[PDB]
Design a protein around this ligand. Structure first.
Ligand SMILES: *[C@@H]1O[C@H](CO)[C@@H](O)[C@H](O)[C@H]1NC(C)=O
Ligand SMILES: *[C@@H]1O[C@H](CO)[C@@H](O)[C@H](O)[C@H]1NC(C)=O
Ligand SMILES: *[C@@H]1O[C@H](CO)[C@@H](O)[C@H](O)[C@H]1NC(C)=O
Ligand SMILES: *[C@@H]1O[C@H](CO)[C@@H](O)[C@H](O)[C@H]1NC(C)=O
Ligand SMILES: *[C@@H]1O[C@H](CO)[C@@H](O)[C@H](O)[C@H]1NC(C)=O
Lengths: 49, 99, 50, 78
């Protein structure tokens, strides 16, 4: 691709073309009060429904 | 964007109803013609010049508003720096990806 | 009394431009070919200076 | 920062100018107010009524072109 990451491959046995994608995606935020207040947190996931 | 539009609507409504008083404290109502006479008095022109030529000034105001409204549909050079802001952000992120 | 006071303020500075190929390598083609991997690192500098 | 804040407002009836003897009188620095009995002239930031004389006002034209013109009297000292 544009960033020289190997994204397409041809299978050496059954010659078909496959894409490779990373398996980490989406940003995560942690909402907390102070540590001395409580140890309970909330998690917000962007990019998920 | 809805909250920013609500803020601007509140500002414009407060200008059209209470004038200049609500910036300092609470809103003090005044009819719009007397407020415009107060604005004329603050330039140097006397108060009678508004009241004796009210229709012409209102017509010129409406025509200038319509001129801006007709100009914003046609020209594209206006709002040319907000586009520069969004273009620069996009280009910076794409340069990070390509490096 | 009528007093006249002077006040001096800067407005602009000098416009400069650089060439990476002459600064980094000079006139050697081996360095010039080795600089192609560092390719997007000077369009950034020229963009900022312009 | 030490600042002045107005408070405790009330509503009066108002007019742009007053027509007296066929000529229109405009206030100099203030507004015409009606408080239910008679018409006074006041400053806009503090409520302190003043009677309408020739010194408070000034004349411009006849009372036929202003919208909201009313009839009242203007006190001349002689
Ligand atoms: C062995 O490789 C060939 C490709 O040369 C392929 O056609 C064939 O299916 C492969 N054999 C098996 C058992 O997958
Ligand atoms: C999440 O899925 C629901 C189910 O149809 C849909 O109505 C909603 O619009 C989706 N959320 C977003 C942000 O598109
Ligand atoms: C202003 O005062 C008048 C009394 O003359 C009253 O009728 C009116 O309701 C008041 N305005 C408001 C917004 O209450
Ligand atoms: C209006 O103001 C005058 C000024 O003293 C006062 O005499 C009069 O009583 C006021 N009217 C009412 C209805 O309070
Ligand atoms: C004011 O006086 C003029 C002449 O005296 C009269 O024509 C006019 O109707 C009066 N205005 C009102 C509101 O009564």
């Amino acid at each position: 691709d544009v960033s020289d990451f190997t994204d397409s491959v041809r299978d050496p046995k059954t010659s078909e073309i496959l894409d490779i994608s990373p398996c980490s995606f989406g940003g995560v935020s942690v909402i907390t009060p102070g540590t001395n207040a409580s140890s309970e947190v909330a998690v917000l996931y962007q990019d998920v429904n | 964007d809805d909250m920013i539009a609500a803020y601007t609507a509140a500002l414009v409504s407060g200008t059209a109803t209470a004038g200049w008083t609500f910036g300092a404290g609470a809103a003090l109502q005044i009819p719009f013609a007397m407020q415009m006479a107060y604005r004329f008095n603050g330039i140097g022109v006397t108060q009678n010049v508004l009241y004796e030529n009210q229709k012409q000034i209102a017509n010129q105001f409406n025509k200038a508003i319509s001129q801006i409204q007709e100009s914003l549909t046609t020209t594209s050079t206006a709002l040319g720096k907000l586009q520069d802001v969004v273009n620069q952000n996009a280009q910076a992120l794409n340069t990070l990806v390509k490096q | 009394s009528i007093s006249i006071t002077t006040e001096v303020m800067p407005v602009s500075m000098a416009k400069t431009s650089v060439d990476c190929n002459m600064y980094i390598c000079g006139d050697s083609t081996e360095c010039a070919n080795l600089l192609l991997q560092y390719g997007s690192f000077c369009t950034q500098l020229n963009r900022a200076l312009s | 920062h030490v600042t002045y804040v107005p408070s405790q407002e009330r509503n009066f009836t108002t007019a742009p100018a007053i027509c007296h003897e066929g000529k229109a009188y405009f206030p100099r620095e203030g507004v015409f107010v009606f408080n239910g009995t008679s018409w006074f002239i006041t400053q806009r930031n503090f409520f302190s009524p003043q009677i309408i004389t020739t010194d408070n006002t000034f004349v411009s034209g006849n009372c036929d072109v202003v919208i909201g013109i009313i009839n009242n009297t203007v006190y001349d000292p002689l």
